[PDB]
RNA sequence: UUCGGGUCUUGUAAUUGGAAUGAGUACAAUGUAAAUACCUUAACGAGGAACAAUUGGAGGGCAAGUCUGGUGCCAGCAGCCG
């Protein structure tokens, strides 16, 4: 659809996070 | 609360210095000129000019190699959004 | 219109830098030069630092 | 301490300031025209239809409120009516959740200065089940909280009932949106700028058939004004969105369409449209003057007001003879100079006394206001804007017109001439038309050492030498900047690209705007490919201004050795000729394995070669470089955008990107495969055993011997 | 402390450029400096 | 001389940020 | 030095 | 060894 | 190359105001009616100055001299030197320096060397204690004007370092609508290779003529000999009243010519200042231009200084004719309700002006 | 603490199986003044189980890179910049 929906990175905002397990 | 008058140590050379992470803020409720630490010279980038800086305390616990003495403070909300926000990259600095 | 033929004019520069950005660089503007690969005896009149 | 803060200035009228302006934004097919409606309909008491263009209402006794529904699918219009905008009534999908137009509108206005926000989500009634309602209203609360404050409030409307929504919500929406109690914001109280209302040509029909349906016509604008007092006097230089950078002809003030009720009625007290409550015209139902005359001679006015060059410096005098006979004496100017009896002597003592301290320790202004340094600047603040108020009241006609010009809220109609035909042919009323008072330093060209970096929800790095819509003052325009880092801050340095996640320097040609400004820009415009990412691209705030820069891009030349001795080497296949050696000796070569160098005398037989000394045997293998700077020059490139000039007023297509023009042409990204890295495994090395010369084995004595 | 992982990122080693596989293993600071300490060794028990 | 040259200014610019650091770094300990 | 910092110019003729 | 010795020299300093 | 100017009148003063502004200008019939039609040494040298201190500007000059194209650039100063032309002191070439010093995007460190003094031009004293507490007033602190070597006419051979680093952002606006008290009249009494004896003989004329009042005076005796000294001999005084009050100056000076009476020079100059104080109001007219343009230029406010009908001559007259034809700026003026007197408040909205080159 | 000492089925971003279940969504009923939940519950719903948990603290390493100082080849500051 023409609608654009939001990214996931832009939805949850985890700006900069580390590798965790 | 503070203004940030001018950025110390723009024209150092070695990257994270101490003299680079200081700025200079003048406290709101007397008029009166301190300087206060911003870690991260890219969060220095992130505090520039007439600003409203949220200063909070230093209590270090120990020295390091070359930090400067006799500055005392910490920038902490620069216009009104965190530093370590901004600097994560949750946030957005509005101006 | 005075508008369009500024359009044209911005059309021919558009043109002009599309070919330049998409064509080779200079041999100044690359980097580690070799002795053929950069023109013969230029770096006398080139004047670098 | 809370409620401390850095002192600014709020230019806005007390006496008759302007409708509020308010943006209703969004989405493309989310009830946005029915909130505007509905909104129209609750404040004034009637329905309304084919509304567009700026439409201006008038709320409670001294607010009035101009709607725009934004277009749903123009990011220029989108970028300049936040620029100007006062509350934007942002509202969201609620079945869909957050879009992708919502999250470019917030950054716009986050980087603009961020005016009042205020959501509102609609299609609520379309959820069966009122949990999943609740959970979904509540998440995006907040994420709109971290988008926009935390505890900024939002709005729910359930269903169009009537094409209106329900009248409570409404109502609520309403008086809030009535006590909003806007703030001051630097660009808008620094500039002066209207939004414009009416748009009318003007030419003779006759003359625009001889010329051809190609002369540029004179276009009269009519609307309130924002900001900043325009200078009345005709010829300043304003910009209109989209439309290009013009100059005005000629000004006029007229009576407001919908003067507010208080306005009105004092009006009507003075001298002894309750129907027309609304108006969306877009849509359908003496010393001074002897100074001041030109044709007058100087030394006309001096002679008239009583009854030369400048280059000198001391100003004319008489004859020391007529001076001196004259002042024997000084009493008329001892005055500027400085029981009964004794009462007398007390109060001029304190006389001298006041003179002798006088404005020492005048209140110190601290312990007057209230002991903080805050409230003190603002008081200063105040005073100043008084001072303005009684002197502007002295006087009637000039004090209004020619000395502030008019100062905002004032419904004034104004005509440019040379504007395209094409503006006036294609333009539709659905599109915001604003103008803005540009400064000097605004109007100028040079290049602006600006600091930007990638913005962070954008994909893609952003190459230099590649296009750049960016947004900066009044302006969009499209330039090739060029990303310099300084090495430590020993030179400017350009980089290849946009460091992933942090500022790096920029520098662009483009029109000055003053230091300390943020700007954002984009890379695509165009309506037409957009795809599903995220549009703007790059932020920053302008550092400093001027014409040129010193801008340094890294070569280095690379040798190689052919012959090696012990600290020696002979190098070839680095330069051409004896003479370009010549030029070059005594340099800092270092090799790969990092052992400094020079170079030392050229060579003769071989036409290039030369023997260079290290600190350390080179091998044969390694590789010798001499690090060297070469000056880079920034293109001029500036093309900006006029999509109200285009017809589509989308897809307006600038310069093409590296990577499109590539695909188009069908090209390669080319790369050199010597360039590329690869996974090398080092094995160890067995060092050969030493030998001894055979005189000195001959020579050592017996028990410290090789056994 | 306070520095990111992309701020500790990496970097490659280029390798040998390709026309010279007959001179092999260009020579980085590592084995540079292994080399050098081995022969000065040498001229330590040389002088000796 | 284009080399002698280059070693005299970079010698001056080097002493004026030396100086110009213990300016600065006396300014904050005494300010 | 001269001609390479400075970039405005006079132009005069007689 | 090494490892450990470095890390010693550092607790110390 | 757009807005027109007549006549060799005030010409740096519209080059000046060219420069702030920003627009272009054209000045056309420079002294048309000439044996030698066109600039002099003098203004060619200033065009000169200009262009070494700013950056980015264009300046175009008719091949007969006689119409000159100004298309300015940004301010940017640094460090120079200039060598003034003897035909015009560096108090000429100072007073436009004066104006563009504060908004530069770096400090002002100007050498002159040349003369250093004349009867149309303002003195090296003139110039400190004449202006520099103007500039004060209106917010620039750092500004000084040593005197390395003090000149003469007609050899000259003086230097003056002109230092400017208060690089405000637009002066603060003004409101002084009393005329100060007067407190005390200090001077400056210098000569070149002469006699003390000689200053000293100024020096008594001067106190001669003022032993009427009761204020306090004092003038410092300046006397320089052997090679800081200049090659000519020569001699001058400069006298200023100051108001402490506030801060604010009225100065009135003069030099010696050759054959003049030390005694006589100083009580003229005496009885000139003390003239100069009864027009004045507020301000000399010598120091008023200045005060003028740095309101004009402060930020978009009103500012108020008194002025007296004295003050208010044809000088005054072209003055403000050419900043509306620069700025487009009228200036109000406004009776004050005194009766005694008839002093006039002159009100100036000042445009948004800021010292945009400056880096952050 | 350095010389070294002790001890032992452990190690891996290796392959692979068929099971369990609620977060969620949902006929229904229960609940309730009416509902929304909870508690029960048909049909759905798990292999990056992408159905994507965090907030702090400590340390290392990498380059034809950068800066600064030196009794070569080193040391320091540091390194999103080759
Ligand atoms: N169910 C539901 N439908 C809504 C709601 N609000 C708007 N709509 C629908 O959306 C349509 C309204 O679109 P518009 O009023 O034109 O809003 P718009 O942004 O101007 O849409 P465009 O004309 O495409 O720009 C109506 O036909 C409604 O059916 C709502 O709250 N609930
Ligand atoms: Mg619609």
Redesign the pocket.
Known sequence: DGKRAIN??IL?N?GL????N | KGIVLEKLGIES?????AIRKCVRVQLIKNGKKVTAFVP???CLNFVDENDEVLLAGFGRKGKA??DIPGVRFKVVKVSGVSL?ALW?EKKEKPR | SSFEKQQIEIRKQIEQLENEAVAEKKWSLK??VKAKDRPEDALLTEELE | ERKLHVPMVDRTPEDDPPPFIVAVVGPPGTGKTTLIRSLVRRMTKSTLNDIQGPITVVSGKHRRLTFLECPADDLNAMIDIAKIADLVLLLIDGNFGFEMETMEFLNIAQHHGMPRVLGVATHLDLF?????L??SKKRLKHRFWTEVYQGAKLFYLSGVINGRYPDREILNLSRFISVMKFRPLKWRNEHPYMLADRFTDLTHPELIETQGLQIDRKVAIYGYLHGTPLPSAPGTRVHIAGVGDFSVAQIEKLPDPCPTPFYQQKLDDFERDKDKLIYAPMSDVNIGKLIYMDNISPEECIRRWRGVDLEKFVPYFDTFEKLAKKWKSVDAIKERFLREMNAAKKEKLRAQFEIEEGENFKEDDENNEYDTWYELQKAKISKQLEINNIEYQEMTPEQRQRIEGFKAGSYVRIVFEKVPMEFVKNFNPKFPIVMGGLLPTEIKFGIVKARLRRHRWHKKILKTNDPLVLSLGWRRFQTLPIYT????R??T?M???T????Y?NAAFYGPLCSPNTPFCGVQIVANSDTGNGFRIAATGIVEEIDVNIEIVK?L?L?GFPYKIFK?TAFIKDMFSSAMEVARFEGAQI?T?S???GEIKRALSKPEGHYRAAF??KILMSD?V?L?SWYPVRVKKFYNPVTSLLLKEKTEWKGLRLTGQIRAAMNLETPSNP?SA?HKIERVERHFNGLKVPKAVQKELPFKSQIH | ????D????????????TSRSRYGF?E???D??KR??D??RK?STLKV | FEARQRIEE?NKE?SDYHAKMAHIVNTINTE | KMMKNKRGGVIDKR | ?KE?????A?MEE | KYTTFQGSQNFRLRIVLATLSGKPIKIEKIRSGDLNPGLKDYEVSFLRLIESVTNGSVIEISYTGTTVIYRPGIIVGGASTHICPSSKPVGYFVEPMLYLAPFSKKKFSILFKGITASHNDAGIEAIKWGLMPVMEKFGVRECALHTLKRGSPPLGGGEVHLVVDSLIAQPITMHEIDRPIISSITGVAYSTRVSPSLVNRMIDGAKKVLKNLQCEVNITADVWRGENSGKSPGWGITLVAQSKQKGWSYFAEDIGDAGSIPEELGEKVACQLLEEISKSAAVGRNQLPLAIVYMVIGKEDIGRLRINKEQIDERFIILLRDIKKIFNTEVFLKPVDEADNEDMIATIKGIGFTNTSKKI
């Open positions: 996931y990175q949850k985890k996070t580390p590798k965790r | 050379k070695q990257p994270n210095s991260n010279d890219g190699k070359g370590l994560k | 980097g580690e | 069966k089940s009122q949990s999943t609740r959970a880092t300084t090495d430590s020993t030179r340095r980089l290849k690209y460091p992933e996640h942090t790096c890294k280095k690379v600290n270092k790969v990092g052992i400094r600190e350390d590789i470089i690090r010597d890295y | 402390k306070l520095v990111h992309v701020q500790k990122k990496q970097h490659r080693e280029r390798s040998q450029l260009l980085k600071h590592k540079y400096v050098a300490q022969f000065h001229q | 970079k080097s | 060894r450990r010795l470095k890390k010693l550092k």
